[PDB]
Each structure stands twice: as structure tokens, then as C-alpha cells.
């Protein structure tokens, strides 16, 4: 049994540290156990679509409150998966501005932390990388631009579109 729990709003924080319910927000991705529950990752609900990374769910369905969310699109190479709707997160990183990682670590409250991604060279091209370390289960945490928009997901890199 995998389920999601809302953890807060997607907002850029001005006083941040510097270095089937489908309500918009950031959600913990949880799997129930006989003894307890475990946070397997994080995801973003936006425009009635839930967005998380493939390694977190592997296309498994998600129960949101009473209702159920079914997978719609997925790609293992990209490590992404969307539920009941196609991918809605289209914003991109300018390639030079500081971003905010909205980290939602297991067992801890959500927090924002500003940082400047490094640009990592790849055969596909330049990419942004948030050089921060958070526990297992923080994957899927949203990366925000100054306007509160999701430009990427923690652990996956950030696309540049200047």
C-alpha cells in the first residue's frame, strides 16, 4: 500500500536558509508496513496531476485520502512518473539564478534552502545540479525558481532553458 500525505504549499521563502484528493501542494510518498510507515519519496501535485520520480513508485498506484491515483506517464531513463494526467511541470532554470530546494525529509517538517546549482556537462548538454545531501526518501522534493515554480525535482538535475 502506497499513499501520499500533503506536506505544505509550493512557495519561495524570503527568509530561507542560504548556502482522489489532488489538491495542489508538495506531498510525501509513503508505503505502509505492519509496524509503521516509511517515506519513499516526495512529489508535486499541480493541475490535478501528481509528479514524482520513477524509482520512488515504479508506476505503482497511489491512494490519496479515500480515492486512488493511477499512473499516466513514466520514463525510467528520466526517472519520472506522472499520475492521472501528463507532465505539467514545464518551467526551466535560467542557468544563473539561485534556486530554492523545498526539501521534505522523512520525519521532518518541510523547509526551503537557497542554493546555486552547479552546471554539469553532459553528452545531452549543460544541466543544473543541486549539490545538497538529504536522507533517503527526500527524492522528488521540488526545486523552485524566484516565482515559486517547479524547475526540477531533487535528485534528477535541473534543465536549463535560457
Swiss-Prot record:
Portion of the parent chain present: 1418 to 1656 of 3419
Peptidase S7 domain sequence ranges: 20-162
Modification after translation, per record: Acetylated by host KAT5. Acetylation modulates NS3 RNA-binding and unwinding activities and plays an important positive role for viral replication.
Active site, UniProt feature: 55 (charge relay system), 79 (charge relay system), 139 (charge relay system)
Quaternary structure and partners: Forms a heterodimer with NS2B. Interacts with NS4B. Interacts with unphosphorylated RNA-directed RNA polymerase NS5; this interaction stimulates RNA-directed RNA polymerase NS5 guanylyltransferase activity. Interacts with non-structural protein 2A. Interacts with host SHFL; this interaction promotes NS3 degradation via a lysosome-dependent pathway. Interacts with host CEP63; this interaction disorganizes the centrosome and inhibits host innate immune response.
Name used for this protein in its record: Serine protease NS3
UniProt membrane topology term: Peripheral membrane protein
Lineage of the species this protein comes from: Viruses, Riboviria, Orthornavirae, Kitrinoviricota, Flasuviricetes
Domain of life: Viruses
Compartments where located: Host cytoplasm; Host endoplasmic reticulum membrane
UniProt function note: Displays three enzymatic activities: serine protease, NTPase and RNA helicase. NS3 serine protease, in association with NS2B, performs its autocleavage and cleaves the polyprotein at dibasic sites in the cytoplasm: C-prM, NS2A-NS2B, NS2B-NS3, NS3-NS4A, NS4A-2K and NS4B-NS5. NS3 RNA helicase binds RNA and unwinds dsRNA in the 3' to 5' direction. Leads to translation arrest when expressed ex vivo. Disrupts host centrosome organization in a CEP63-dependent manner to degrade host TBK1 and inhibits innate immune response. Inhibits the integrated stress response (ISR) in the infected cell.
Amino acid at each position: 500500500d502506497m499513499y501520499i500525505e500533503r506536506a505544505g504549499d509550493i512557495t519561495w521563502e524570503k527568509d530561507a536558509e542560504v548556502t482522489g484528493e489532488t489538491t495542489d501542494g508538495v506531498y510525501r510518498v509513503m508505503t505502509r508496513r505492519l509496524l509503521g510507515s516509511t517515506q519513499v519519496g516526495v512529489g508535486v501535485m499541480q493541475e490535478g496531476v501528481f509528479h514524482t520520480m520513477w524509482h520512488v513508485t515504479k508506476g505503482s498506484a497511489l491512494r490519496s485520502g479515500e480515492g486512488r491515483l493511477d499512473p499516466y506517464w513514466g520514463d525510467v531513463k528520466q526517472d519520472l512518473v506522472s499520475y492521472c494526467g501528463p507532465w505539467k511541470l514545464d518551467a526551466a532554470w535560467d542557468g544563473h539564478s539561485e534556486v530554492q530546494l523545498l526539501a521534505v525529509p522523512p520525519g521532518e517538517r518541510a523547509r526551503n534552502i537557497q542554493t546555486l546549482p552547479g552546471i554539469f556537462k553532459t553528452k545531452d548538454g549543460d544541466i543544473g545540479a543541486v549539490a545538497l545531501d538529504y536522507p533517503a526518501g527526500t527524492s522528488g522534493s521540488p526545486i523552485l525558481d524566484k516565482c515559486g515554480r517547479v524547475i526540477g525535482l531533487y535528485g534528477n538535475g535541473v534543465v536549463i532553458k535560457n
